[PDB]
Amino acid sequence: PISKIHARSVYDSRGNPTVEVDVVTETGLHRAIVPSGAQHEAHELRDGDKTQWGGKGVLKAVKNVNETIGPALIKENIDVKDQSKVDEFLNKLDGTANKSNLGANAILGVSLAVAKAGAAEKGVPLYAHISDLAGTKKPYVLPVPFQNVLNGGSHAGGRLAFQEFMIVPDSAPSFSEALRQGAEVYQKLKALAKKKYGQSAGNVGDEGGVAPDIQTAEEALDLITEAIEQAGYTGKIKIAMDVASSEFYKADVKKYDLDFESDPSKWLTYEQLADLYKSLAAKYPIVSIEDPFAEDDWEAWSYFYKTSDFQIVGDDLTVTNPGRIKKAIELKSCNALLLKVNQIGTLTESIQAAKDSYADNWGVMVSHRSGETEDVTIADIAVGLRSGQIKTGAPCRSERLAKLNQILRIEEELGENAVYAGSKFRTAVNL
Amino acid sequence: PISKIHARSVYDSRGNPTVEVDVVTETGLHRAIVPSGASTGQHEAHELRDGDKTQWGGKGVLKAVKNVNETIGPALIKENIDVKDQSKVDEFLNKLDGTANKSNLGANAILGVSLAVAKAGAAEKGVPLYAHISDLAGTKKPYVLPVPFQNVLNGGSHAGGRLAFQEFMIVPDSAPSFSEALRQGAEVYQKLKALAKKKYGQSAGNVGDEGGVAPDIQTAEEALDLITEAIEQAGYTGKIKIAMDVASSEFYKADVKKYDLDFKKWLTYEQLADLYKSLAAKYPIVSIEDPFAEDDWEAWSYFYKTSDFQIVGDDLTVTNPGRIKKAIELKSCNALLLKVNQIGTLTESIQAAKDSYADNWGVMVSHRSGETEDVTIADIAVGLRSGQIKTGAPCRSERLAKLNQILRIEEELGENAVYAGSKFRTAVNL
Ligand SMILES: O=C(O)[C@@H](CO)OP(=O)(O)O
Ligand SMILES: [Mg+2]
Ligand SMILES: [Mg+2]
Ligand SMILES: [Mg+2]
């Protein structure tokens, strides 16, 4: 049984507080940290004291764990291996749809730490425990890393509207080789950004990529193309994009602004914006595009889904919510889910969201948040869900690479009992 | 005894491979990762790299990893040394390498085993690593939590720009606790980053290798004014001090005996000493690291004689007891920057700290510019009773993981620990 549940405040990769939860059983201490992003999302609880951390404190969510959730869960005396019963009891304590009573960050912290307690009691690592929960088959599939190497949009100075530009090393024979290839391409890109845009262009962003003053999407894609050629991996490494188009969708006119100080004549309809995506995908090896249209522009998604053979990933459209996923399935809006566990609040609901996506032959890309920690839970999640896709930043900044290092340890531990997803990442759950 | 010693390759916070070692005993697995520096000194321990320019640009550590798995691992297991006797372990590791600079088997191969065995030794004792280190170092109780020297504005070889000086740090020593000092630094950092964007564009908000903001500024007076304004906006003026790591070995043209403040009109060491004295009388600068070159011993002594603030040796002393002895005898500095991977073992790192304490030096346990999720130096700083740690800005988790670990140590110890505060230069005898 659980002997102690204790939470505390730690700092994330941006320097903001977040929740860390300890769960102690006979097998030892089991610790998890909650991420944080920068929507119909799960309501995370912030203190709001503008004299402490700029109002970003989480003392209230920590207190809810220590004073309310903890003692109630210990008295309930649920088997730590039964994640469904644990998370059901956590949502019963909260009692709200968006987890606004106790806080999504407080609930998830207990949920993930109890999951590691359940894994430790079974004598298996977390990814094996999650595979039992999700019912994924063996051998384990190691995910292809979608490594963000260049950033635009609201996180850059140029007119580039797209947010994230990633490299996809899917042709590598192993996850270990896919990491070295991505690492080498990233070094060639950082040196290119320095030589082409100045020494300051090498300073990284929140996720570890560069963000120089770039004006067009092809200018960013050309720079990535040049970095892949220098490393000698042309044709073996693909490209992914996270447009984050909710940042520049003017809902009043149903038009998209590619310079969100702009002109009113170049504002793209979703038919015009899709033509630019189709043109880029016919020129560059773009195999995955995330959030190409706004979070509530369902008609645009379905229009784009009908003609596209590449992966169409929902993030702000789906917010890891099975209700939004069911609607996206019924309207044929996307074919992949970006899984952010803190967008829904519990591991069980996160697994259910992945299962609902698999039922429509979707891909699942387990993702990080822009504010990450040294916690590596999502590395075991991507392996346990047999997702074949993980998105956890550049090969830079350790809140990003600690996830990749963990998969290296999982890769070495499993050996023959694990296969790399490869080019079959969109269907890895049935690989 | 030891049942398994295994090493693998992992990536550091810059994307370069480094060495991670596992040591398994009856108490379980014990793991440590070796850091890696960018502004390395010439006298540091030899870091073994593969040199295969087709793999990681020649920065692989497959040979250092192999040296642990095929040479060091089997040799230490057969010797059957008590995991608590760190001295005999580190003495045995140096016997296998047999070289002074740890060239042979690789200092990154030796350090990984040394730090992992240390965590295994602590677990057999049933105590945390900082307690086991306090036993090895002979430091008294209660435990002293370190003042976090947070490099909030990066420069030099740590960030792209025109700023010559490497590190500009804030020193929250007036705070009543480590936890409050960490909140103060996080609040000042948020005021600084917003101020850097407003004053120098959104590009100035991007960070360097150690998490600090990198505005494209020229002089150190600009950086100090920016930090000063951020401290005032946060409301902690007079409670937070300022420290600098010049890393002047990076721009010391040794031929003309001059320092290039634009190495990306050079000064002598007298002219550079006048600049330091003018900045220290203008800003609350309480500690300056590497103000002169790693072998410019005359300049260090010339500057030490007239300065009451902390003068920290880094590339001058490279955590080497032989270099520390010279600096003591020549009166070159009054503080040591302790980097474990500069010397190669934990015992030699501890001995370097004790030799500094004998001359009433301060000791600042430091990270490297390329760090990992490893948090060993947090327990090292608390175990050595150093009262001051340098582990980066409150940004990028390879920096904060050490800070988060000290928060857990703070909560674990309660009243059995005290924050070093303003006594960080003399915290060992606090
Ligand atoms: O110079 C230093 O003090 C260290 C830590 O800041 O940097 P590097 O590891 O690059 O030597
Ligand atoms: Mg997105
Ligand atoms: Mg967004
Ligand atoms: Mg230094």
Short mmCIF file of N, CA and C in Angstrom, two decimals, chain B residues 201-310:
data_model
loop_
_atom_site.label_atom_id
_atom_site.label_comp_id
_atom_site.label_asym_id
_atom_site.label_seq_id
_atom_site.Cartn_x
_atom_site.Cartn_y
_atom_site.Cartn_z
N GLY B 201 15.47 43.73 -28.91
CA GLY B 201 14.72 42.92 -29.85
C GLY B 201 14.42 41.53 -29.33
N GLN B 202 13.43 40.89 -29.95
CA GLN B 202 13.00 39.56 -29.52
C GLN B 202 14.13 38.54 -29.64
N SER B 203 15.07 38.76 -30.55
CA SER B 203 16.21 37.86 -30.69
C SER B 203 17.05 37.82 -29.42
N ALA B 204 17.06 38.90 -28.64
CA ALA B 204 17.82 38.93 -27.40
C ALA B 204 17.24 38.03 -26.32
N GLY B 205 16.01 37.54 -26.50
CA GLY B 205 15.41 36.64 -25.53
C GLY B 205 15.89 35.21 -25.62
N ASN B 206 16.51 34.83 -26.73
CA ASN B 206 17.10 33.51 -26.83
C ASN B 206 18.25 33.36 -25.84
N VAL B 207 18.55 32.12 -25.48
CA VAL B 207 19.46 31.84 -24.39
C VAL B 207 20.75 31.23 -24.93
N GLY B 208 21.79 31.31 -24.11
CA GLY B 208 23.06 30.69 -24.41
C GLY B 208 23.13 29.27 -23.88
N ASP B 209 24.36 28.74 -23.82
CA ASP B 209 24.54 27.35 -23.43
C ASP B 209 24.14 27.11 -21.98
N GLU B 210 24.19 28.14 -21.13
CA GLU B 210 23.92 28.00 -19.71
C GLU B 210 22.59 28.62 -19.30
N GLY B 211 21.71 28.90 -20.25
CA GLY B 211 20.37 29.37 -19.96
C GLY B 211 20.23 30.87 -19.83
N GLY B 212 21.33 31.62 -19.79
CA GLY B 212 21.24 33.06 -19.67
C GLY B 212 20.92 33.73 -20.99
N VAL B 213 20.27 34.89 -20.90
CA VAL B 213 19.95 35.66 -22.09
C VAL B 213 21.23 36.16 -22.75
N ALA B 214 21.19 36.28 -24.07
CA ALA B 214 22.35 36.69 -24.86
C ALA B 214 21.99 37.88 -25.74
N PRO B 215 21.97 39.09 -25.17
CA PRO B 215 21.83 40.28 -26.00
C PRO B 215 23.13 40.63 -26.70
N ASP B 216 23.00 41.24 -27.88
CA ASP B 216 24.17 41.60 -28.69
C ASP B 216 24.67 42.96 -28.21
N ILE B 217 25.40 42.93 -27.09
CA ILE B 217 25.96 44.13 -26.49
C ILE B 217 27.48 44.03 -26.49
N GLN B 218 28.12 45.18 -26.34
CA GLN B 218 29.57 45.28 -26.46
C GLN B 218 30.28 45.23 -25.11
N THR B 219 29.98 46.17 -24.23
CA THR B 219 30.74 46.34 -23.00
C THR B 219 30.10 45.58 -21.84
N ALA B 220 30.90 45.34 -20.80
CA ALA B 220 30.38 44.73 -19.59
C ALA B 220 29.52 45.72 -18.80
N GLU B 221 29.75 47.02 -18.98
CA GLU B 221 28.91 48.02 -18.33
C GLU B 221 27.47 47.92 -18.81
N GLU B 222 27.25 47.58 -20.09
CA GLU B 222 25.89 47.41 -20.58
C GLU B 222 25.22 46.22 -19.91
N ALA B 223 25.92 45.09 -19.81
CA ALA B 223 25.35 43.92 -19.17
C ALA B 223 25.05 44.18 -17.70
N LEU B 224 25.95 44.88 -17.01
CA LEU B 224 25.76 45.16 -15.59
C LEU B 224 24.58 46.11 -15.37
N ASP B 225 24.43 47.11 -16.24
CA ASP B 225 23.28 48.00 -16.15
C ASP B 225 21.98 47.25 -16.39
N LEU B 226 21.99 46.29 -17.32
CA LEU B 226 20.80 45.50 -17.59
C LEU B 226 20.43 44.63 -16.39
N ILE B 227 21.42 43.99 -15.77
CA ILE B 227 21.17 43.20 -14.56
C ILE B 227 20.72 44.11 -13.42
N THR B 228 21.32 45.29 -13.30
CA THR B 228 20.94 46.22 -12.24
C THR B 228 19.47 46.63 -12.38
N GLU B 229 19.04 46.95 -13.60
CA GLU B 229 17.66 47.34 -13.82
C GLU B 229 16.70 46.19 -13.54
N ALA B 230 17.10 44.96 -13.88
CA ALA B 230 16.24 43.81 -13.63
C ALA B 230 16.10 43.54 -12.13
N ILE B 231 17.18 43.73 -11.37
CA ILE B 231 17.11 43.55 -9.93
C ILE B 231 16.19 44.59 -9.30
N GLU B 232 16.25 45.83 -9.80
CA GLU B 232 15.38 46.87 -9.26
C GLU B 232 13.92 46.61 -9.60
N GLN B 233 13.63 46.18 -10.83
CA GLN B 233 12.24 45.89 -11.19
C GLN B 233 11.67 44.77 -10.33
N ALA B 234 12.49 43.78 -9.99
CA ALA B 234 12.05 42.69 -9.12
C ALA B 234 11.97 43.10 -7.66
N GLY B 235 12.53 44.25 -7.30
CA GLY B 235 12.41 44.75 -5.94
C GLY B 235 13.40 44.19 -4.96
N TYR B 236 14.56 43.72 -5.43
CA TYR B 236 15.55 43.10 -4.56
C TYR B 236 16.88 43.85 -4.60
N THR B 237 16.85 45.14 -4.91
CA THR B 237 18.07 45.94 -4.92
C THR B 237 18.69 45.96 -3.52
N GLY B 238 19.99 45.68 -3.45
CA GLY B 238 20.69 45.61 -2.20
C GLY B 238 20.65 44.25 -1.53
N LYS B 239 19.76 43.36 -1.96
CA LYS B 239 19.69 42.01 -1.42
C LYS B 239 20.28 40.96 -2.35
N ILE B 240 20.57 41.32 -3.60
CA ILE B 240 21.14 40.41 -4.58
C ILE B 240 22.41 41.03 -5.13
N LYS B 241 23.52 40.30 -5.06
CA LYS B 241 24.81 40.78 -5.50
C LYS B 241 25.09 40.32 -6.93
N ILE B 242 26.29 40.63 -7.41
CA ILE B 242 26.68 40.35 -8.79
C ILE B 242 28.05 39.69 -8.78
N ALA B 243 28.21 38.67 -9.62
CA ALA B 243 29.48 37.98 -9.79
C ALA B 243 29.78 37.86 -11.28
N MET B 244 31.06 37.67 -11.60
CA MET B 244 31.49 37.58 -12.99
C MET B 244 32.47 36.43 -13.16
N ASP B 245 32.32 35.71 -14.27
CA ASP B 245 33.33 34.79 -14.78
C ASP B 245 33.84 35.39 -16.08
N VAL B 246 35.00 36.03 -16.02
CA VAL B 246 35.56 36.67 -17.21
C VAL B 246 36.01 35.63 -18.22
N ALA B 247 36.62 34.54 -17.75
CA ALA B 247 37.22 33.53 -18.63
C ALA B 247 38.19 34.19 -19.61
N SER B 248 39.10 35.00 -19.07
CA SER B 248 39.98 35.82 -19.88
C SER B 248 41.07 35.03 -20.60
N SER B 249 41.19 33.73 -20.32
CA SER B 249 42.09 32.90 -21.13
C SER B 249 41.62 32.81 -22.57
N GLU B 250 40.32 33.02 -22.81
CA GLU B 250 39.78 32.93 -24.16
C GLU B 250 40.29 34.06 -25.05
N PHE B 251 40.66 35.20 -24.47
CA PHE B 251 41.04 36.36 -25.27
C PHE B 251 42.35 36.98 -24.79
N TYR B 252 43.28 36.17 -24.31
CA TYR B 252 44.59 36.66 -23.89
C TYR B 252 45.61 36.31 -24.97
N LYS B 253 45.90 37.28 -25.84
CA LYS B 253 46.97 37.11 -26.82
C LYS B 253 48.31 37.04 -26.09
N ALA B 254 48.76 35.83 -25.78
CA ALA B 254 49.92 35.66 -24.91
C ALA B 254 51.20 36.24 -25.49
N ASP B 255 51.26 36.42 -26.81
CA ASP B 255 52.46 36.96 -27.44
C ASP B 255 52.69 38.41 -27.04
N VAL B 256 51.70 39.27 -27.29
CA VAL B 256 51.82 40.69 -26.95
C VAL B 256 51.50 40.98 -25.49
N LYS B 257 51.12 39.97 -24.71
CA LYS B 257 50.74 40.13 -23.31
C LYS B 257 49.61 41.15 -23.16
N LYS B 258 48.50 40.87 -23.86
CA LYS B 258 47.36 41.77 -23.90
C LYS B 258 46.08 40.96 -23.96
N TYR B 259 44.98 41.60 -23.57
CA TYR B 259 43.66 40.98 -23.54
C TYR B 259 42.76 41.66 -24.56
N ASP B 260 42.08 40.86 -25.38
CA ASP B 260 41.25 41.34 -26.48
C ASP B 260 39.80 41.32 -26.03
N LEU B 261 39.26 42.50 -25.70
CA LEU B 261 37.86 42.61 -25.30
C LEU B 261 36.89 42.54 -26.48
N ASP B 262 37.36 42.12 -27.65
CA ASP B 262 36.52 41.98 -28.84
C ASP B 262 36.98 40.78 -29.66
N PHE B 263 37.32 39.69 -28.97
CA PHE B 263 38.01 38.56 -29.60
C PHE B 263 37.13 37.78 -30.57
N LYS B 264 35.87 38.15 -30.74
CA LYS B 264 35.00 37.46 -31.70
C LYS B 264 34.92 38.24 -33.01
N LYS B 265 43.33 47.78 -29.74
CA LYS B 265 42.84 48.38 -28.50
C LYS B 265 42.78 47.36 -27.37
N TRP B 266 43.81 46.51 -27.30
CA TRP B 266 43.90 45.48 -26.28
C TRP B 266 44.55 46.04 -25.02
N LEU B 267 44.21 45.44 -23.88
CA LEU B 267 44.64 45.95 -22.58
C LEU B 267 45.77 45.11 -22.00
N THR B 268 46.68 45.77 -21.29
CA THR B 268 47.63 45.09 -20.43
C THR B 268 46.89 44.53 -19.21
N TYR B 269 47.62 43.81 -18.36
CA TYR B 269 46.99 43.33 -17.14
C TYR B 269 46.80 44.44 -16.11
N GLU B 270 47.59 45.51 -16.19
CA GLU B 270 47.34 46.66 -15.33
C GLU B 270 46.09 47.41 -15.77
N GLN B 271 45.93 47.62 -17.08
CA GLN B 271 44.75 48.30 -17.59
C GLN B 271 43.50 47.46 -17.36
N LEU B 272 43.62 46.14 -17.48
CA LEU B 272 42.48 45.27 -17.18
C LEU B 272 42.16 45.27 -15.69
N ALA B 273 43.17 45.41 -14.84
CA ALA B 273 42.92 45.49 -13.40
C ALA B 273 42.24 46.80 -13.03
N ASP B 274 42.55 47.89 -13.75
CA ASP B 274 41.87 49.15 -13.52
C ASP B 274 40.39 49.06 -13.89
N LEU B 275 40.09 48.32 -14.96
CA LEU B 275 38.69 48.12 -15.35
C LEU B 275 37.92 47.37 -14.28
N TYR B 276 38.54 46.33 -13.69
CA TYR B 276 37.86 45.57 -12.65
C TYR B 276 37.60 46.43 -11.42
N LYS B 277 38.61 47.20 -10.99
CA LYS B 277 38.44 48.03 -9.81
C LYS B 277 37.38 49.10 -10.02
N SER B 278 37.25 49.62 -11.24
CA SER B 278 36.23 50.62 -11.51
C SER B 278 34.84 50.01 -11.52
N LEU B 279 34.71 48.78 -12.03
CA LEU B 279 33.41 48.12 -12.03
C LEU B 279 33.01 47.65 -10.64
N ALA B 280 33.98 47.23 -9.83
CA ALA B 280 33.68 46.76 -8.48
C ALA B 280 33.29 47.91 -7.56
N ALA B 281 33.83 49.11 -7.79
CA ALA B 281 33.44 50.26 -7.00
C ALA B 281 32.12 50.86 -7.47
N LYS B 282 31.69 50.54 -8.68
CA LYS B 282 30.45 51.06 -9.25
C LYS B 282 29.27 50.12 -9.05
N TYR B 283 29.50 48.81 -9.16
CA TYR B 283 28.45 47.81 -9.03
C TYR B 283 28.75 46.88 -7.87
N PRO B 284 27.73 46.29 -7.25
CA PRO B 284 27.98 45.39 -6.11
C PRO B 284 28.57 44.05 -6.55
N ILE B 285 29.77 44.09 -7.13
CA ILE B 285 30.45 42.89 -7.60
C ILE B 285 31.22 42.29 -6.42
N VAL B 286 30.87 41.07 -6.03
CA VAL B 286 31.46 40.43 -4.86
C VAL B 286 32.39 39.28 -5.22
N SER B 287 32.46 38.88 -6.49
CA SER B 287 33.29 37.75 -6.89
C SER B 287 33.60 37.86 -8.37
N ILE B 288 34.88 37.75 -8.71
CA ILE B 288 35.35 37.77 -10.10
C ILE B 288 36.16 36.51 -10.34
N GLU B 289 35.79 35.75 -11.37
CA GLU B 289 36.42 34.48 -11.69
C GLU B 289 37.28 34.64 -12.94
N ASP B 290 38.45 34.00 -12.92
CA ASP B 290 39.44 34.07 -13.99
C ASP B 290 39.66 35.48 -14.55
N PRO B 291 39.99 36.47 -13.70
CA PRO B 291 40.22 37.82 -14.22
C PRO B 291 41.43 37.92 -15.12
N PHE B 292 42.36 36.97 -15.04
CA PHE B 292 43.55 36.98 -15.86
C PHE B 292 43.82 35.57 -16.36
N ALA B 293 44.82 35.46 -17.23
CA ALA B 293 45.05 34.22 -17.97
C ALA B 293 45.43 33.08 -17.04
N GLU B 294 45.30 31.86 -17.57
CA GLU B 294 45.55 30.65 -16.79
C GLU B 294 47.01 30.52 -16.36
N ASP B 295 47.94 31.18 -17.05
CA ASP B 295 49.35 31.16 -16.67
C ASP B 295 49.91 32.56 -16.46
N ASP B 296 49.05 33.57 -16.31
CA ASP B 296 49.51 34.94 -16.05
C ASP B 296 49.57 35.18 -14.54
N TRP B 297 50.47 34.43 -13.90
CA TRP B 297 50.55 34.42 -12.44
C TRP B 297 50.86 35.80 -11.88
N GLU B 298 51.68 36.59 -12.57
CA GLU B 298 52.02 37.92 -12.08
C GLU B 298 50.78 38.80 -11.98
N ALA B 299 49.90 38.72 -12.98
CA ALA B 299 48.69 39.54 -12.98
C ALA B 299 47.77 39.17 -11.82
N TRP B 300 47.64 37.87 -11.54
CA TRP B 300 46.80 37.43 -10.43
C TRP B 300 47.31 37.99 -9.11
N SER B 301 48.61 37.86 -8.85
CA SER B 301 49.18 38.37 -7.60
C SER B 301 49.06 39.89 -7.52
N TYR B 302 49.29 40.58 -8.64
CA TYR B 302 49.15 42.03 -8.68
C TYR B 302 47.72 42.45 -8.32
N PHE B 303 46.73 41.67 -8.75
CA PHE B 303 45.33 41.99 -8.50
C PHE B 303 44.88 41.53 -7.12
N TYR B 304 45.40 40.39 -6.65
CA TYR B 304 45.02 39.88 -5.34
C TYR B 304 45.42 40.83 -4.22
N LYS B 305 46.56 41.52 -4.37
CA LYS B 305 47.09 42.31 -3.27
C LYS B 305 46.20 43.50 -2.91
N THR B 306 45.38 43.99 -3.83
CA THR B 306 44.60 45.20 -3.60
C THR B 306 43.10 44.97 -3.56
N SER B 307 42.64 43.72 -3.62
CA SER B 307 41.22 43.41 -3.79
C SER B 307 40.70 42.66 -2.57
N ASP B 308 39.58 43.14 -2.02
CA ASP B 308 38.94 42.50 -0.87
C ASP B 308 37.82 41.55 -1.26
N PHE B 309 37.38 41.55 -2.51
CA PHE B 309 36.31 40.67 -2.95
C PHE B 309 36.86 39.28 -3.28
N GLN B 310 35.96 38.38 -3.67
CA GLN B 310 36.36 37.02 -4.00
C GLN B 310 37.00 36.96 -5.38
#
